Design a protein around this ligand. Structure first.
Ligand SMILES: [Zn+2]
Lengths: 186, 311
């Protein structure tokens, strides 16, 4: 199963609420950041709760995206990688603070549009819940803002520089689904 | 022969001593498999295993760091701290425009960065320009090129171990030399694609990049590595990557250093089973005539790009 392309979802994460320092960590080098696996983890939790130890099998909506809990069960390669969200310049983090975030999508099949859409819908579920905490009482609300999509098709890595297309910045997740459709090369 | 330049992302940090060329090979191979499948690789394994690589070296704008030649000529006892030579400075050691023997104090006082990197006189002023150094001597200037930090992680019970994280300065980039040793365009483009995928794939562990670009060798490297030049007849050569010798190159090895390449400790089940390791010559080892190399077998690349050397 060859790789057809990468779809990077770059953007900004903003804090509506203050945050102490599981969700927000302070790097070994002193840098403030939100660990990618934390973010991705809460997205797993919500995206799995809205479908009725994370899920672990080959064929499934959630397990094709985030990958199964065990590596002995991978039928198809993992499609999503959530980069660590580092704090941008201009114990508790003040509200209004911005973390530049990046989400990498590995597209192998032409039906993985709905996987990306499922992840973005997960982000929408997280936008109106809480980053830190789980289940009954979460803490620190979060809002996604300024989101661009970048397409790096197989033809881009092979040498074609202009095959790399980039959508323009949208203010919310809801506007992504259109900008997603306006970008599909492979 | 082409140069690959990797510009690290802004808040990126790496986990890998330097990043050896066999790890680069494994990266370009996992990327080849990722782009073209596991089948199309073993239809070209005999042509990817015959590429020549250098290890992951450091680039400062137009200054290219190369390992220090492990020749005894380069031995108070402060000279045991240096590990790098700018390619220009290294070239000046060939044309005798730089005198190691009787001018070491001028080199150590006016031409060495962080007591570990020797450069040329013609690079001093731009080094001072970049990092805002006003000191008349470079001896009196500690430049923050990399930031190291060990961390205590576990493999919660099991084995405790340390992992060293490296952070690069905004003016510092990675680079490595690649020799395809071939001309099949349909293959070259897929090697360069596998190399270019690192941009979003990363190195180590992962540390990601903002741009991975394949360009032609800078003019020092090209004026040195061109086989239609003087240096071609130089009788010794220095490894720029790890070297895994075949039964024939063992008679060409003069001064060298050994390191052990190998595997993961996939369990505790294997704490009863022996640990077979692959011996290799470190970057900077000197060999006479020509070093061919080998690729053990998961692949372990040991064919290093050689760089003409004269004592
Ligand atoms: Zn599942």
């Amino acid at each position: 199963l060859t790789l057809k392309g990468k779809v990077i979802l770059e953007g900004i994460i903003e804090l509506e609420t203050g945050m102490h320092i599981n969700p927000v960590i302070r790097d070994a080098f002193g840098r403030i950041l939100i660990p990618g696996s934390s973010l991705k983890g809460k997205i797993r939790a919500l995206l799995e709760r809205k479908d009725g130890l994370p899920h672990d099998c080959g064929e499934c909506e959630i397990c094709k995206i985030f990958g199964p809990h065990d590596s002995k069960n991978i039928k198809e390669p993992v499609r999503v990688i959530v980069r660590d969200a580092y704090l941008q310049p201009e114990e508790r983090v003040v509200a209004g603070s911005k973390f530049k975030f990046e989400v990498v999508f590995n597209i192998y099949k032409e039906s993985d549009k709905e996987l990306i859409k499922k992840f973005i819908e997960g982000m929408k579920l997280l936008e109106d819940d809480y980053l830190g905490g789980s289940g009954s009482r979460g803490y620190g609300k979060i809002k996604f803002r300024d989101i661009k999509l970048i397409c790096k098709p197989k033809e881009y890595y092979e040498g074609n520089e202009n095959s790399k297309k980039e959508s323009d910045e949208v203010e919310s997740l809801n506007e992504l689904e259109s900008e997603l459709d306006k970008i599909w090369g492979g | 022969m082409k140069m690959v330049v990797l510009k690290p992302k802004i808040n990126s940090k790496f986990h890998f001593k330097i990043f050896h060329s066999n790890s680069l090979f494994s990266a370009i191979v996992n990327n080849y498999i990722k782009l073209y499948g596991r089948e199309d690789l073993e239809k070209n394994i005999e042509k990817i295993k015959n590429i020549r690589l250098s290890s992951l070296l450091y680039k400062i704008k137009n200054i290219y760091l190369i390992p220090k030649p492990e020749h005894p000529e380069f031995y108070p006892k402060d000279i045991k701290k240096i590990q790098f030579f700018s390619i220009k400075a290294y070239k000046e050691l060939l044309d005798n425009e730089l005198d190691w023997k009787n001018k070491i104090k001028h080199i150590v006082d006016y031409q060495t960065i962080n007591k570990s990197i020797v450069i040329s006189e013609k690079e001093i002023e731009e080094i001072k320009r970049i990092f805002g150094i006003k000191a008349e001597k470079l001896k009196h200037a500690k430049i923050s090129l990399i930031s190291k930090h060990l961390e205590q992680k576990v493999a919660d019970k099991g084995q405790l171990y340390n992992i060293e994280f490296i952070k690069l300065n905004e003016n510092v980039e990675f680079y490595f030399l690649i020799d395809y040793n071939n001309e099949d365009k349909e293959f070259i483009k897929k090697l360069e694609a596998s190399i270019k995928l690192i941009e979003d794939e990363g190195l180590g562990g992962a540390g990601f990049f903002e741009k991975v670009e394949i360009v032609d060798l800078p003019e020092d490297f090209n004026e040195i590595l061109d086989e239609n030049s003087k240096y071609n007849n130089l009788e010794y050569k220095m490894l720029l990557g790890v070297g895994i010798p075949n039964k024939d190159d063992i008679k060409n090895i003069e001064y060298y250093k050994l390191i052990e390449i190998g595997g993961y400790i996939y369990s505790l089940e294997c704490l009863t089973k022996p640990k077979r390791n692959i011996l290799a010559l470190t970057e900077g080892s000197i060999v006479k005539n020509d070093f061919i190399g080998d690729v053990k077998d998961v692949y372990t690349h040991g064919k290093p790009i050689l760089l003409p050397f004269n004592p």
